[PDB]
Design a binder for these strands. Structure first.
Ligand SMILES: [Mg+2]
Ligand SMILES: [Mg+2]
Ligand SMILES: [Mg+2]
Ligand SMILES: [Mg+2]
Ligand SMILES: [Mg+2]
Ligand SMILES: [Mg+2]
Ligand SMILES: [Mg+2]
Length: 1376
RNA sequence: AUGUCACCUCCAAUGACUAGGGGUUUCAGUUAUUCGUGAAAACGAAUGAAGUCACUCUUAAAGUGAGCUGAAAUCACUAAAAAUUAAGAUUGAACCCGGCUACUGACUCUGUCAUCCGGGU
DNA sequence: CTAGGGTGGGCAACCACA
DNA sequence: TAGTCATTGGAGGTGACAT
DNA sequence: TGTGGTTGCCCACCC
């Protein structure tokens, strides 16, 4: 045997790894290797599918609209029997855009408006009548508001401005009524439901198919739709048709267009009818909407012409219900059943004889008792496959009966086991008389000819059970039990009866009549159990502690408070309900004591009354079998069934742990195969650290802390006021992430959905709050007075810092047992400054993706790692006859931390774990080493792992610490490059955000000619001898004095010079076209406001000359025209900063005005009233600037009419695959060799030209360059188009002498070393080597630590000496 | 005490469906007429919407830029539609076809449909 | 467990050089 | 941003047995 | 009056 060992300190980002191989016992000095895996949380690897899912659903919404237009056009040209004009197509598509959401907001309450007299509100609207109720006139007011009545709208803002000061109203109410609180509530509701009408007209369309009403009003007022209207014979029929098609989901349109013959957009009536009935049979309607469902299907199924049904069926009925993807990907239950198939594949028909012989014994009386009921339901996958085949061969009822009896025999409890099979096959024996008579009984019952093989089976079974309980069923080689791999049910009534029977300790529960029994008075079992669960959920995880403390205090005779007296009343209730239940269905006393507690009664209520919300863990066969085995109405008959404990982590957790397990399996793979050994068993033990993190309240913390759903909790935390605007909020608001969704996704790859990050605000406070930061000064003053008692921002800042400073990390993470003040302090700490200690603590404590990546993920990670290492070393073990005998052990984190990490910290000071700051990278390897140091302590681990010589604490504690090697390797995974992927579509292969693509006009006046926008000096550049420009621009220009290029012809020629080799004339034309070309892009006017530091920026920043100047430089070859143009749009920016209400906030040079983006949005507003009710609102206002550019591509797509359009994007990935190498081996460092996922008849690399390359050097080709010295080792690869990658192997003392890095020993180094500009200058100065360059932004990534460092960096800028030395190394390799 | 197993409730993290509303870009349109309400400055309405400024230069006219409005496009191969913004050593997810012999789900429950199963892309 | 602004391109600005 | 549906892990419980 | 090499810095879809 060969002892191979892996120890893993699991980490959300950084994973420590200590691994070795040995012949026996401890490893040598050379065999132990320390690794640290840093998973990139800076988006070098994408684990979260959030960006991919939102891109998928954005494209799905786009294709939903595209296919809805396609279907609408097909049906309308079918109705007209003629082709639509582009104006008709534009009007129909104008109806189809912006269809609004489909949720349930059903009815505004307005109940407080019933008890308020109308005559009090004649002041705001004099036209009101006292004979008319306020509710009726309010309904008519809203009806007028929807009908685009401008007077009604003006009445709305008149009411909005008048009701903000309510001193007169409250004075009159107090003068005529005693209580003013109900009138305060009435005015609050009035101002709360009118402010939501101000919204959803300024921030979004946002209609719950009031789009139907808007389109019903806007169809007759659109003149392009007139020839359609008599074609449909009415505005009503056409509106119903449009609304019915607009309610279709993408899957319906998919099902209609899913045919190659539908590339012709042909109309098929029966296909459309079948698609519509298929579409509305797909939904799971609620119980109150079934009649509506019954209407819609009866329209669609009964259609003798589906096109008239679309015009006839009311589109309000065809609004889809909520999605019900409840059977989406159901779980497979992981119960492990004894397999008749495997048993008669291995033992033939002999195990049948074993079961028959053991059944004949009187000791096995009643072991098959309820099996005629158990065997009805299918329990496993192979039985299901045989039942689908209709040919029961291995899974007949007799074979299942015998296998069930066999497993009940083997899993029998100690009190009932008449054979002591666990003792009989154990390697250790006790007092031999009892084992002697147990073997005698087994021999007498089973038969002496069957004793050997059966016991071998028994030992195998028990071994394979034990592995199954440790999460290691997958490492068995010849299994006897099989996983079920079957979907369980979803808590139907038959499941409810079994679960309630498991609670109540009954076996044959048939109905729930006990639930309706009367306990005391008119209060049923239902009422007391609902009260019990209400109390238990009010007290949370601390309920058991406070309840048991109340019972202990009442037992000892000590005085009870009100809360403990309430708990004593609850104990009286649980005793009464337990007595009534146990008398209702005849439960005896000792079984009544097993559910006479609040928890069992509460979960009785939860099972019986609350609706089902997921699948049960096992199938009903396993539920019934476990109910038989446990025998809760009496004494337990058998041990409960075992299951494969490794539940699947399908998600981003799968991705992170998948990549970690593959990297560790690679390290273990070419650590094993680097050694040379044949035909011997290598046992490979995996060591893991138990990370169990509490996200809800712990017992050890509620003990020291005791001496509304989450959505409603966040809603009630804002106290009915919008935090960002101060408006009365109500219920039509939005839950805002204070730390923005995109920001946290960018630097963390996660969305912080913790309650502290979520604040309930309005649409105004959420749509003006973009990805930019928002501080405490942007919150409204009244909201701060309500929450913190005062609106003083400094006092609130000090209060928040002091209150959060007293909270521990756990008490912040266990968020729900703070009081209201501490919860508000933790949430509002995110509104503080960047340098705030409280905010820096809270942002880090809500990054709970890193805590969930290690929380109990050790079993699945170990399974993944062992399976991968088995498949990498499969051919190596096959070619060397190696058998790998894997193992898994798991170690308590607190034990290894206190008893080994702290001890090594005292022994070696450099090995200490920092608690107040970030851990050094090598410390993770130390933790992994500590895991190994703990695992040698355990006798069970060491007895298979090695020998036992642990004679003293100090001796082994000092002998172990020298095993860890000096150097530690730092493994940085990175995703596959876009040059190597054969599926390049699985990468975001260009950035979203399109750039405006202009060309400079040419102005001619007589002989004189110039390039620019106008004849001003700053707007043009004079061309010397312009006849050469027109000579090299024949066929590309068009005359509008002014000559402008032909956009389509220029784009076609610029694609032709990129995709195919072209003549010199076309290349010169492309050069001129690229020199007249420039790029602008609209950037928002809110960029005058700094959204991060919350201040206005100086005029020299808005009117910075780099943002507007265009450099034009042709040359004599095209007619010399050198100079700089200013962009005319700069004058519009001059309008922005010199306008009436911004010229004082923006200074000439570089106070901190709060919420300036709201001011900018108040400046730009649609003051005129829109004619059309279905019109898009606008929120973002922008002006062009010259943006900074990346590698750009022009894409030739097609518009809806079939015309070629060109849009300019930027690449997200690499554009260059390498550098062209000639026949002699010389690298062409200047030319751009574009990769082959580009170079397509649609794409055009911007300023790109065709290039032929028979051979080239790849960007990944590392070579060792001759650096002129032997102390360092310099490797170099081209890496990128403009920056080489340089890898330096160099002693750490020399690196510190070069740089001045003062991070102490190498154990305290990070994985990414950030050099200051003084340290970069020191590196360049002391290296005295221009061949090294300097690191880009001082970023150095360490590959191996130690006394000799090995680190790589991207050079800040290329340099001819690097290219020369790489050319030298490449020529040395190329000649050989 | 901690290991399985089954339930209950919370918290956190996932990924799945359905989307919504702004952006950006391309292509157009617009740089106003008519009516009645005013002596008029101006107001309102109708023209499907928009229809307002600024540099150049005969002064007009024009050029150019911006705004506004409406459509369209918003990864490529690439399309009827599926996959397509993850990973690649392995995969996962999605979507479609057939089936109801049968695991799961929804109903109007001998059955039909499906997010289920089998297969395919 | 975690202490959070990367990279693969582009541009303009100077400084030799013809 | 909004609905809806499932899963995994942990914390607090109840019940079974088994170290 | 190009032409190439360094240096310095900027960009990225949101709610
Ligand atoms: Mg650890
Ligand atoms: Mg927000
Ligand atoms: Mg660690
Ligand atoms: Mg536009
Ligand atoms: Mg069924
Ligand atoms: Mg189907
Ligand atoms: Mg699916």
């Amino acid at each position: 045997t060969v002892k191979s060992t892996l120890a893993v300190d699991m980490g959300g980002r950084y994973t420590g790894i200590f691994s070795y191989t040995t012949d026996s016992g401890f490893p040598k000095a050379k065999e132990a290797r320390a690794y640290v895996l840093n998973m990139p949380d800076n988006d070098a690897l994408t684990y979260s599918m959030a960006a991919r899912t939102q891109t998928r659903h954005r494209i799905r919404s786009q294709q939903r609209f595209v296919l809805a237009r396609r279907l609408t056009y097909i049906l309308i040209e079918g109705k007209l029997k003629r082709k639509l004009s582009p104006r008709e197509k534009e009007a129909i598509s104008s109806l189809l855009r912006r269809r609004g959401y489909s949720r349930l907001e059903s009815e505004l309450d307005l109940s407080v408006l019933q008890g308020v007299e109308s005559g009090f509100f004649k002041c705001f609207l004099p036209n009101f009548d006292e004979d008319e109720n306020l509710l009726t006139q309010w309904t008519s007011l809203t009806d007028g508001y929807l009908q685009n009545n401008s007077d009604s709208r003006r009445q709305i803002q008149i009411f909005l401005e008048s009701s903000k000061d309510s001193k007169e109203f409250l004075t009159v109410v107090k003068s005529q009524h005693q209580d003013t609180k109900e009138y305060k509530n009435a005015l609050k509701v009035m101002r709360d439901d009118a402010e939501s009408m101000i919204e959803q007209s300024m921030f979004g369309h946002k209609h719950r198919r009031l789009y139907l009403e808007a389109i019903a009003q806007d169809i007759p007022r659109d003149s392009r739709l007139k020839p359609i209207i008599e074609a449909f014979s009415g505005v009503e029929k056409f509106h119903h048709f449009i609304g019915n098609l607009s309610n279709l989901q993408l899957r319906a349109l998919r099902w209609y267009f899913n045919d190659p013959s539908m590339k012709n957009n042909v109309f098929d009536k029966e296909r459309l009818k079948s698609v519509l009935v298929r579409a509305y049979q797909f939904f799971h309607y609620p119980k109150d909407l079934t009649q509506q469902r019954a209407e819609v299907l009866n329209a669609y199924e009964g259609a003798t012409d589906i096109l008239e049904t679309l015009q006839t069926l009311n589109p309000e009925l065809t609004i889809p219900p909520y999605e019900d993807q409840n059977n989406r990907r159901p779980p497979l239950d992981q119960t492990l059943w004894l397999s008749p198939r495997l048993l008669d594949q291995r033992y033939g028909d002999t195990w049948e004889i074993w079961v028959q012989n053991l059944l004949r014994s009187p000791l096995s009386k009643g072991i098959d008792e309820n099996l005629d009921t158990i065997l009805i339901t299918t329990d496993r996958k192979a039985r299901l496959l045989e039942r689908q085949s209709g040919r029961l061969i291995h899974y007949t009822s007799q074979k299942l009966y015998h296998s069930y009896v066999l497993q009940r025999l083997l899993d029998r409890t100690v009190e009932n086991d008449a054979y002591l099979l666990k003792t009989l096959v154990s390697s250790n024996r006790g007092n031999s008389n009892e084992i002697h008579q147990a073997q005698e009984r087994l021999t007498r019952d089973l038969g002496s000819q069957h004793i050997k093989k059966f016991l071998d089976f028994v030992r195998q079974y028990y071994d394979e059970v034990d592995k199954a309980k440790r999460g290691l069923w997958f490492i068995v080689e010849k299994p006897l039990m099989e996983r079920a791999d079957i979907h369980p049910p979803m808590k139907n009534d038959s499941v409810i009866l079994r679960l309630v029977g498991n609670i109540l300790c009954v076996s044959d529960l048939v109905d729930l009549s006990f639930w309706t029994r009367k306990v005391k008075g008119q209060s049923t079992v239902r009422s007391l159990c609902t009260a019990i669960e209400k109390t238990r959920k009010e007290y949370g995880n601390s309920f058991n502690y406070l309840y048991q403390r109340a019972l202990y205090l009442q037992s000892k005779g000590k005085k009870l408070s009100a809360e403990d007296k309430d708990f004593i009343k609850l104990q009286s209730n649980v005793l009464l309900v337990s007595d009534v239940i146990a008398e209702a269905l005849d439960i005896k006393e000792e079984q009544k004591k097993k559910f006479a507690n609040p928890f069992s009664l509460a979960q009785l209520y939860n099972i019986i009354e609350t609706e089902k919300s997921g699948f049960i863990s096992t199938t009903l066969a396993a539920v019934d079998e476990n109910a038989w085995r446990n025998n809760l109405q009496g004494k337990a008959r058998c041990v409960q069934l075992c299951a494969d404990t490794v539940r699947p982590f399908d998600g981003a957790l799968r991705n992170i742990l998948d990549r970690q397990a593959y990297e560790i399996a690679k390290l273990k793979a070419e650590e094993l195969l680097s050694t040379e050994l044949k035909n011997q068993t290598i046992d490979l033990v995996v060591l893991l650290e138990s990370n169990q993190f509490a996200f809800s309240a712990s017992l050890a913390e509620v003990k020291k802390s005791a001496n509304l759903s989450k959505d409603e909790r966040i809603k009630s935390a804002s106290r009915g006021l919008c935090p960002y605007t101060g408006k009365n909020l109500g219920d039509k608001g939005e839950v805002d992430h204070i730390i923005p969704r995109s920001l946290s996704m960018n630097y963390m790859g996660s969305i912080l959905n913790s309650e502290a990050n979520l604040i309930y605000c309005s649409q105004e406070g959420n749509q003006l709050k973009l990805n930019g930061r928002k501080k405490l000064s942007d919150l409204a003053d009244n909201y701060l007075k309500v929450v913190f008692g005062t609106a003083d921002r400094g006092t609130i800042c000090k209060y928040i810092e002091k209150s959060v400073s007293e909270l521990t990390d756990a008490k912040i993470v266990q968020f729900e047992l703070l009081d209201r003040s501490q919860q508000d302090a933790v949430r509002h700490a995110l509104f503080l400054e960047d340098f705030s200690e409280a905010r820096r603590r809270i942002i880090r404590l809500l990054g709970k993706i890193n805590t969930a990546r290690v929380n109990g993920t050790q079993a699945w990670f170990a399974k993944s790692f062992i399976t991968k290492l088995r498949e990498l070393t499969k051919e190596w073990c096959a070619n060397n006859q190696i058998t790998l005998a894997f193992d898994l052990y798991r170690l308590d984190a607190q034990t290894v931390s206190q008893d080994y990490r702290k001890k090594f910290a005292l022994i070696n000071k450099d090995w200490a774990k920092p608690d107040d700051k970030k851990q050094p990278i090598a410390s993770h390897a130390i933790d992994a080493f500590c895991v190994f140091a703990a695992a040698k302590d355990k006798r069970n681990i060491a007895n298979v792992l090695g020998v036992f010589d642990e004679v003293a604490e100090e001796q082994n504690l000092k002998t172990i610490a020298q095993l860890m090697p000096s150097e530690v390797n730092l493994i940085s995974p990175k995703r596959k490059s876009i040059l190597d992927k054969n599926e390049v579509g699985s990468r975001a292969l260009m950035k979203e955000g399109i750039f405006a693509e202009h060309f400079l006009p040419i102005l001619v006046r007589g002989d004189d000619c110039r390039i620019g926008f106008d004849w001003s000096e700053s707007g043009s550049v004079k061309v010397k001898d312009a006849d050469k420009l027109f000579g090299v621009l024949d066929g590309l220009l068009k005359q509008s004095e002014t000559y402008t290029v032909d956009r389509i012809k220029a784009f076609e020629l610029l694609h032709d010079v990129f995709i195919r080799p072209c003549s010199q004339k076309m290349l010169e034309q492309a050069e001129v076209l690229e020199k007249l070309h420039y790029i602008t892009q609209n950037i928002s006017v809110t960029s005058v406001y700094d959204a991060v530091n919350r201040q206005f920026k100086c005029r020299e920043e808005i009117l910075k000359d780099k943002d507007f100047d265009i450099k034009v430089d042709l040359g004599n070859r095209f007619g010399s025209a050198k100079g700089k143009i200013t962009l005319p749009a700069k004058r519009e920016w001059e309008k922005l900063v010199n306008r009436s209400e911004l010229k004082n906030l923006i200074k000439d040079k570089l106070e901190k005005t709060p919420d300036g983006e709201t001011l900018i949005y108040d400046i730009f507003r649609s003051i005129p009233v829109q004619k059309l009710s279905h019109k898009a609102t606008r929120r973002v206002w922008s002006l062009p600037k010259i943006p900074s550019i990346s590698s750009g591509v022009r894409i030739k797509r097609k518009d809806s009419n079939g015309n070629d359009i060109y849009q300019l994007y930027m690449l997200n990935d690499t554009k260059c695959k390498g550098f062209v190498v000639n026949e002699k081996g010389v690298i062409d460092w200047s030319s751009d060799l574009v990769a082959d996922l580009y170079k397509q008849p649609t794409l055009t690399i911007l300023n790109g030209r065709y290039l032929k390359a028979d051979q080239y050097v790849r960007m990944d080709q590392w070579y060792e360059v001759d650096c002129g010295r032997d102390d360092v080792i310099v490797k170099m690869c081209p890496g990128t188009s403009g920056r080489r990658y340089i890898e330096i192997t160099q002693s750490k003392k020399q690196f510190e002498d070069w740089t001045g890095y003062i991070s102490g020993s190498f154990w305290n180094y990070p994985v990414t070393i950030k050099l200051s500009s003084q340290q970069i200058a020191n590196f360049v100065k002391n290296s005295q080597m221009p061949l090294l360059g300097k690191p880009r932004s001082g970023q150095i990534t360490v590959i191996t630590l130690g006394n000799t460092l090995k680190y790589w960096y991207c050079v800040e800028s290329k340099n001819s000496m690097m290219n020369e030395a790489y050319q030298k190394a490449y020529l040395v390799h190329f000649n050989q």
